[PDB]
Amino acid sequence: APSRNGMVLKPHFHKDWQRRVATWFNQPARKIRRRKARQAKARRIAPRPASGPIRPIVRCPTVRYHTKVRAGRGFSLEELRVAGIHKKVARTIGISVDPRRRNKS
Amino acid sequence: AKIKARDLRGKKKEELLKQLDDLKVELSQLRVAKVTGGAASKLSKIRVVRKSIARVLTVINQTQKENLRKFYKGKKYKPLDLRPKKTRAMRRRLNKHEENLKTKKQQRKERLYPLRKYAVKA
Amino acid sequence: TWRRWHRRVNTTQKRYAICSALAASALPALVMSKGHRIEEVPELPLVVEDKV
Amino acid sequence: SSHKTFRIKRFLAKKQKQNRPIPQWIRMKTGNKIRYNSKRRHWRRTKLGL
Amino acid sequence: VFIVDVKANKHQIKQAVKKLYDIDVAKVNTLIRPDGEKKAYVRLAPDYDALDVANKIGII
Amino acid sequence: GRKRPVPKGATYGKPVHHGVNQLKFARSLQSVAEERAGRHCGALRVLNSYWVGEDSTYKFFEVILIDPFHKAIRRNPDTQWITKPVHKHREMRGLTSAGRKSRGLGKGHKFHHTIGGSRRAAWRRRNTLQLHRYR
Amino acid sequence: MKFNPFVTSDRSKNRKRHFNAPSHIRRKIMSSPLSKELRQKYNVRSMPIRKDDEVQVVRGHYKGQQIGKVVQVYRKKYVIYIERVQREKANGTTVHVGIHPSKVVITRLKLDKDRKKILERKAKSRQVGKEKGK
Amino acid sequence: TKGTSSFGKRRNKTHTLCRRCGSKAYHLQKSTCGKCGYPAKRKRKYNWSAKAKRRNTTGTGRMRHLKIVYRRFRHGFREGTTPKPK
RNA sequence: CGCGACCUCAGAUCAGACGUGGCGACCCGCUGAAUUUAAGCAUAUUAGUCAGCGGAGGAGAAGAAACUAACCAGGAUUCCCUCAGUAACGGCGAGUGAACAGGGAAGAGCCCAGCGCCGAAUCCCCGCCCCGCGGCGGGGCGCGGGACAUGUGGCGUACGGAA
RNA sequence: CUAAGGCUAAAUACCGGCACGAGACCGAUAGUCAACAAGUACCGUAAGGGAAAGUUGAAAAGAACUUUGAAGAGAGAGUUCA
RNA sequence: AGAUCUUGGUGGUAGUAGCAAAUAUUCAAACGAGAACUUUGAAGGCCGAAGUGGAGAAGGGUUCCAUGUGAACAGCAGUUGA
RNA sequence: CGACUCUUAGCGGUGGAUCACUCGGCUCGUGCGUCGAUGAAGAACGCAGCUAGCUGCGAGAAUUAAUGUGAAUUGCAGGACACAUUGAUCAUCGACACUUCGAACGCACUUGCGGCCCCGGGUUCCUCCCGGGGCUACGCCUGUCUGAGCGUCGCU
Numbered sequence A: 001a002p003s004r005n006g007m008v009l010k011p012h013f014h015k016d017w018q019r020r021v022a023t024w025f026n027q028p029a030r031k032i033r034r035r036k037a038r039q040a041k042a043r044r045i046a047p048r049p050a051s052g053p054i055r056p057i058v059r060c061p062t063v064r065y066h067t068k069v070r071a072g073r074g075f076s077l078e079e080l081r082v083a084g085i086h087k088k089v090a091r092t093i094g095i096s097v098d099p100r101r102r103n104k105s
Numbered sequence B: 001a002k003i004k005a006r007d008l009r010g011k012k013k014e015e016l017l018k019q020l021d022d023l024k025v026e027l028s029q030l031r032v033a034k035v036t037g038g039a040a041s042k043l044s045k046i047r048v049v050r051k052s053i054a055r056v057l058t059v060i061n062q063t064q065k066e067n068l069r070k071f072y073k074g075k076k077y078k079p080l081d082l083r084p085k086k087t088r089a090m091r092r093r094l095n096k097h098e099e100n101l102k103t104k105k106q107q108r109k110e111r112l113y114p115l116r117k118y119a120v121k122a
Numbered sequence C: 001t002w003r004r005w006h007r008r009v010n011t012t013q014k015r016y017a018i019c020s021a022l023a024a025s026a027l028p029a030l031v032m033s034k035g036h037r038i039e040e041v042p043e044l045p046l047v048v049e050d051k052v
Numbered sequence D: 001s002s003h004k005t006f007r008i009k010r011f012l013a014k015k016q017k018q019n020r021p022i023p024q025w026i027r028m029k030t031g032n033k034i035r036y037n038s039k040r041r042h043w044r045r046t047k048l049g050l
Numbered sequence E: 001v002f003i004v005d006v007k008a009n010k011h012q013i014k015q016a017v018k019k020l021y022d023i024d025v026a027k028v029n030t031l032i033r034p035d036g037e038k039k040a041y042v043r044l045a046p047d048y049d050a051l052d053v054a055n056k057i058g059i060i
Numbered sequence F: 001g002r003k004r005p006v007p008k009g010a011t012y013g014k015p016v017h018h019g020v021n022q023l024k025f026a027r028s029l030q031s032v033a034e035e036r037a038g039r040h041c042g043a044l045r046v047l048n049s050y051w052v053g054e055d056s057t058y059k060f061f062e063v064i065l066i067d068p069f070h071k072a073i074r075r076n077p078d079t080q081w082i083t084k085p086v087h088k089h090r091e092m093r094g095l096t097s098a099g100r101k102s103r104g105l106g107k108g109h110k111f112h113h114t115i116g117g118s119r120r121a122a123w124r125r126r127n128t129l130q131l132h133r134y135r
Numbered sequence G: 001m002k003f004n005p006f007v008t009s010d011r012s013k014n015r016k017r018h019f020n021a022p023s024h025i026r027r028k029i030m031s032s033p034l035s036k037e038l039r040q041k042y043n044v045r046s047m048p049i050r051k052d053d054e055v056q057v058v059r060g061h062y063k064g065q066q067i068g069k070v071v072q073v074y075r076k077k078y079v080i081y082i083e084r085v086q087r088e089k090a091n092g093t094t095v096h097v098g099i100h101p102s103k104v105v106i107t108r109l110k111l112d113k114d115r116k117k118i119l120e121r122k123a124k125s126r127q128v129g130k131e132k133g134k
Numbered sequence H: 001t002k003g004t005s006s007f008g009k010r011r012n013k014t015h016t017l018c019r020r021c022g023s024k025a026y027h028l029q030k031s032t033c034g035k036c037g038y039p040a041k042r043k044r045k046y047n048w049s050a051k052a053k054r055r056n057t058t059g060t061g062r063m064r065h066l067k068i069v070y071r072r073f074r075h076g077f078r079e080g081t082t083p084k085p086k
Numbered sequence I: 001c002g003c004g005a006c007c008u009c010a011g012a013u014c015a016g017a018c019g020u021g022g023c024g025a026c027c028c029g030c031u032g033a034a035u036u037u038a039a040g041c042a043u044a045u046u047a048g049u050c051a052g053c054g055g056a057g058g059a060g061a062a063g064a065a066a067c068u069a070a071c072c073a074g075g076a077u078u079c080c081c082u083c084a085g086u087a088a089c090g091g092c093g094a095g096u097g098a099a100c101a102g103g104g105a106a107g108a109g110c111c112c113a114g115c116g117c118c119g120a121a122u123c124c125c126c127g128c129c130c131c132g133c134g135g136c137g138g139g140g141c142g143c144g145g146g147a148c149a150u151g152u153g154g155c156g157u158a159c160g161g162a163a
Numbered sequence J: 001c002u003a004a005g006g007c008u009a010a011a012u013a014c015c016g017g018c019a020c021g022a023g024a025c026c027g028a029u030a031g032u033c034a035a036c037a038a039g040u041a042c043c044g045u046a047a048g049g050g051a052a053a054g055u056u057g058a059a060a061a062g063a064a065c066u067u068u069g070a071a072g073a074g075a076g077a078g079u080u081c082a
Numbered sequence K: 001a002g003a004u005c006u007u008g009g010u011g012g013u014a015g016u017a018g019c020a021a022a023u024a025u026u027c028a029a030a031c032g033a034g035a036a037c038u039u040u041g042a043a044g045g046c047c048g049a050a051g052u053g054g055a056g057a058a059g060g061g062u063u064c065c066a067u068g069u070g071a072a073c074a075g076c077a078g079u080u081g082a
Numbered sequence L: 001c002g003a004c005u006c007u008u009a010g011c012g013g014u015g016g017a018u019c020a021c022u023c024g025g026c027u028c029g030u031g032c033g034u035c036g037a038u039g040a041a042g043a044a045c046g047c048a049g050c051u052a053g054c055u056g057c058g059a060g061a062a063u064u065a066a067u068g069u070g071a072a073u074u075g076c077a078g079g080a081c082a083c084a085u086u087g088a089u090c091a092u093c094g095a096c097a098c099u100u101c102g103a104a105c106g107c108a109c110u111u112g113c114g115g116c117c118c119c120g121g122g123u124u125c126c127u128c129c130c131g132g133g134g135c136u137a138c139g140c141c142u143g144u145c146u147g148a149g150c151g152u153c154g155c156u
Ligand SMILES: [Mg+2]
Pocket: B105
């Protein structure tokens, strides 16, 4: 029952939520495991960069973010073609390629 | 004066069976003594004779099994009890050769564009 | 198990508390009141050489 | 009954064999904690499963 | 009177006694005891004496 | 369609569940035929199937099965995948084409029900309450 | 203190291991110190107790310098029996009093090839440790 | 009389021992075990009785083969080898 | 008025293999309520949940766009934070309720059919010899069988490809 | 963007299993039903239901022996720090 | 301190209700610490062949038989006993 | 004076609270993440000198072998065991073995009854009886053999 002034609240707890509750007590353990995996991978690829392939410069899509620029998935085939790198050798020498990305400008 | 498994391995089939039969006869006599009262020493000898029978039988079985393994070594088809018994799934899975063989397209890719060792200056 | 066992404290407040503890550790009355038996220590902000 | 099957007779034989007191020397063992056979069954008090 | 394996039949009991006691048997009667064992009454041939056979077995 | 298998059409409950006729099975008849073929030939692997004819009362499909332990299948790459233990009874887990069509998978705005792999995966993700260590 | 994350400091776990140890490690648990003379002769400190060695009791009701030969290593009750360490019971018969092997000191070892081998192994490890920590 | 007098007439067993699962639930007249469903290939198991599931689940018996499998897994299921002779 | 070839079927305790059942916390495909809330109750809610059936693996499923967008554009899948209790649905009542963009964890791409070219170049089985045993492979030999032109293999797949 | 063919590791899940570690948890009417010969005893035709029950002492050194009583049980004596 | 609360324990009632369906016991002796109840003998009775007799089916499962004991059980007792 | 009743206290009963303990749970986390026709899970029946349960095991039955270890096991007895012409116990466990049901597999079971091929015996090859061994389930894949069709044809 409502009592004096207040906000009309609509809790989404009508659907037996206690069978599906995700606790996070394994979050520090997960961070430790991820760090160990990162270090093991870096040791495995010894002189190669730890983060992986170089990524292209990519402008963010919508009108909210088009002033910002970030890293993309891979270099486009047009970029590789005019840079003189084979699209099958780029991945071997550590260049990410994105065959489905186009260059509008 | 027990019998050991080490000195039984040199013997051949006939005297192994003979000694097994002697042990079985002695065990039956010990059971007769047990049901007719007998003595504590004769009661305690029952376990000794039983373990000696087990020893002789396991030596016989191991010798027969290794002879069968030698006979069936190098044959295309072997009895199931001689084939390895890893695990049902492990026996179903692919062997090494068909696990690691590749297509001509795949090995052409590996030959033409192999992974390179490289470093990037900062 | 979802009792909310953990509390998050503001970083500025945590740094503030560290500063307060450090400032109090240089006052002989407060260390004596913690009962640390500083009566023959030559200087309470006790600093030793790097050889240690 | 007098007419019975071999499996029923074997079941009853096992029940007869295991319905007996504990040996006296059990109580002398190190750390026994057993006083008596608590699984004793009487033919008139409690009836068998079959 | 012998206590025999429950899976042994009259023919097997007869052959076993004949082999490992070197005696000839007239007939075999078989029952299964209330304790689950099998008991065999083996009647010997007339020319064999159960008394001295029992003596040499050692169950006098 | 799929008549509800209730005695005398009595589905005891609220009227929204009183439906007996005009009900439809979630999976297609091609998927059902694939499942029947696989269940009979449980030693084989269903690859795909196709339509060969239909009547007013019957639909006819032909299902391709692969023997995963034949040496021709087993010694050939690009076919060894069907021999893996994870690829058994694909028609029963809905991993063939016909069985996949009913799961609502796909990319884009029409297939938001199955973000995460399946409807059940999406439902678990969207109905699980994440209680972090620090709230 | 303990840093290995695979050995437990749990009291219940340690007690369970101790009381349910099999006999081949109950032998190691039932070890006794050597005398000063034996510790000087063999560069070892402690030794597992053995059926036919001579010990003297250093704690309890039977303290003294009398040397008694072990007559039984009763590993189920974690005790040993010594020659004159016994008491009269009601009906006049003497029963051995079991005492813990950590409360005795070995004055003469029952030596065979295995005991000798263990002695040189322990001495060699101790010498290696001394040379490492020198 | 539905009580004491009627209890005197029960002299015919409905159930006997089941050759699978060894339980006294083998309906003789239906020739079917009410606990395991013996003539059926698959075991009778229901999720509305977790207690019944745990009464007869894996591990409640001997696990003659599974114990050996658990031990053998720790060495990679090695076969055909022996320890180095002394 | 028989003998052969093919086709479509049958039998075999034929030679050699494979499936069945269990567990089922996690996963996949179905089927699927009512208690409950709505201060009654029928749509709604509970809930695509409990129960029921089938199928797996150490993970599974998903997955390399018949996508998002509308921007100066991003670029497989999965997971986390946020978007967001929002757009929207709803006796528009009770209640229900995503996605895109953004930041991260991880990051990996590919293969056929078809269209074509190449003397079927292809594959399985059985005998013989040698090198090996340890999950049964390698090499060679057989005017040795079979599959296969109602299409095997190599090149090649939308990022174009071939000559 | 190129459907109606196919494969693919990682990041993710894990109240079953094997082996571990820990805890501002519980402490024998608590904590698992089950600290113990517990899914046991027992109940029901069956599906199924389902307990109670820890502690001598450091060490049995667990009371020799005498005495009344048919015995249970007592009176002395003895062990033990008790 | 309450919940016709949960589990366990204990009172008054109270040495009370009660140990009353189917005619019935008595004498002597033996064993025995101990006899209304055991055993033997004698007597008086009952079931009265549709039995309180002699044997089976179902069901029970060792209750069958011999010996021994007198803890507990056989709602008094017992030297007897399923 | 008594009995009886009540109150209080001492002692003794009945009862098992409290306290102390804890080889048990509960919770969280980590690493692995492995069943089965080569017969699983489960069940039954057996196995110890004295052994009912629990535990362990399978007619080699409270265990055999091997390896490590190195003098016990123990409630009693018995007997090993130069610990070197090799060794108690325990642990590990890779060799061997692993009864009957059970997906359970010759047919069937609240019982029982077959068939085929070898071996041995009574027989004195000839197949009757007895014993022993190996096979005899359903579905399905490749191949093989034997076939069927007024299916399509060819030759005659
Ligand atoms: Mg190709």
